[PDB]
Each structure stands twice: as C-alpha cells, then as structure tokens.
Amino acid sequence: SIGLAHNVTILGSGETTVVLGHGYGTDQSVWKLLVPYLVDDYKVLLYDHMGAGTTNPDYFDFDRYSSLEGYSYDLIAILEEFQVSKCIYVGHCMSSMAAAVASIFRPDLFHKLVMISPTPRLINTEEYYGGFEQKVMDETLRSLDENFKSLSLGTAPLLLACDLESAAMQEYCRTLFNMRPDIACCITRMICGLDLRPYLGHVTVPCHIIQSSNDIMVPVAVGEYLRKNLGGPSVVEVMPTEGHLPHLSMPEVTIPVVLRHIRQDITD
C-alpha cells in the first residue's frame, strides 16, 4: 500500500486530523517535539516523502520525482488511503508547496495549510528574487554528484544557522545522508529547478506562512510575496529565528508559533 511505502504513522484522537509533512533532508522524526502538543486534541498522520532514507529505493521513480507534482499526487493518495478530509496540513519547504499544489486539485482534503519556510522558486529573474543566480547554480550542479556530501556539509551550518558540531546539525546530517546518493541528487535538482509561481493564484485554501527572519534559502520578502499571490486568505508570521529548519534548530520559539497556526483559523 502507498501508506506502508511512505511509513505512515497515526497517533492521537479527535474529529480533526493534522497531517505532518517533513521537508528536504529530514523524515517524520523531525516532528518529535511538536507531537506531544497535538496528541490530546487531534488525530495526527505522519508520513515520509518518497526518497527519504527511510523509504525503499525500489519505489523511487526518477521521472516522477524530478518535478514536485509527483509528490502532490502521492500526497493525495496517502490522504485517501486513510480516508482523510479537511485536514490541517503542516509542511516544511517542498512539502508545504506540494500540499499547496495538491489542494488545487483536491481542496476538499485540506482545511488549511501551515507552511514552514516555503518558497515557490529559488532562481532569480529580473522581476523575482529567490536568492540564487542561475549561472552560479549551473556551475554548482554540474559537479553535484561527486561533491554531494562535501557541498552539503560545507553549506549546512549557514543553511541551518547552527554550528557544525551542534545537536541540530548532527540530526539533520543523519537523515540527509540516509538518502541514497542518486536519489538525493535527483531531489536536490528538483528543488533547485522549482517554479511554482503559476499555481499560486489558483490555491484557495487558507495558508499560514511561517518564516525565519534570516534564511539563506528564503528571502524574507518571499513570505510577503506568497501573501500577495496566493488565491485564498493567508497570514505571514516572521519569527525571531534564523535558519531554514527553525522547527529543528529553534523549537522553543518555533513550536509555539506552529501550534498557534494549527489551533487558530483565519477563516469561519
């Protein structure tokens, strides 16, 4: 079953289901500090996206997972398998964008989207600043495969905004390097090539955008942009955190913020 292949875990109890979708380089273990604050009030569904190191490499389709849509379609199937409707979806980076795309096709499945550090496009254009220049990205990606570990280690302290020897770093690297190398490179290239901007106006479910004040992968203005271009109601909350995985590195600040967005609707 697709849910078995995605390591679906179900906990808690309640009329409303919260779905937790981890971001690049992590797995559902990233949510371990949030869960205790949900278990008494909600049913919670956790899953691993295909290609996480905890998933079977034989199920990784390099054609489907070279664009984000494959993840969105897979998300729908998982929610259907466990008969999940009008969920509160909480995602980090790519998973939040995957859910946003999914919600265009199946708005019935989503009550709201809570999005940690989302970005619809990394590469800069004349009109849009994503934080990365095409010609530099082209050089970096040309030698990505042979340099995956060294490039990833070398950048991770600034990506996470924490020291190379920190507990948060050790945890991130544990899951990042759990991915099979070819799979990791495929997912990395997919993220680097994202352009979800054409979808945004067609997203109508409520979106809660949670950002760090400084994130090398998400310029702070991307949050304000998300608000201006999403088709439904949205809220933007910039936190006094640094780093792209503030739920991992700064949970004392980030968990209370995430909880507020889960618990409090901006509609009805």
Residue numbers in the entry: 3 to 270
Task: Quote the original article.
Surprisingly, in all crystals, ShHTL7 associated with the 4‐(1,1,3,3‐tetramethylbutyl)‐phenyl hydrocarbon moiety of Triton X‐100 that we used during protein purification. Triton bound to the deep active site pocket, formed by a double V‐shaped arrangement of helices α4–α5 and α6–α7. However, Triton remained at a distance of more than 8 Å from the catalytic serine S95 in the active site. Well‐ordered water molecules filled the space between Triton and the bottom of the active site pocket. The Triton polyethylene head group protruded out of the active site pocket. Five ethylene oxide units were visible in a relatively weak and poorly defined electron density, suggesting weak association of this moiety. In ShHTL7S95C, the sulfhydryl group in C95 was oxidized to a sulfinic acid, as confirmed by mass spectrometry, causing only a minor rearrangement of the H94 side chain in otherwise identical structures (RMSD of 0.108 Å).
Striga hermonthica is a root parasitic plant that infests cereals, decimating yields, particularly in sub‐Saharan Africa. For germination, Striga seeds require host‐released strigolactones that are perceived by the family of HYPOSENSITIVE to LIGHT (ShHTL) receptors. Striga hermonthica has a set of SL receptors, among which ShHTL7 is by far the most sensitive. High‐resolution X‐ray structures reveal that Triton X‐100 specifically plugs the catalytic pocket of ShHTL7.
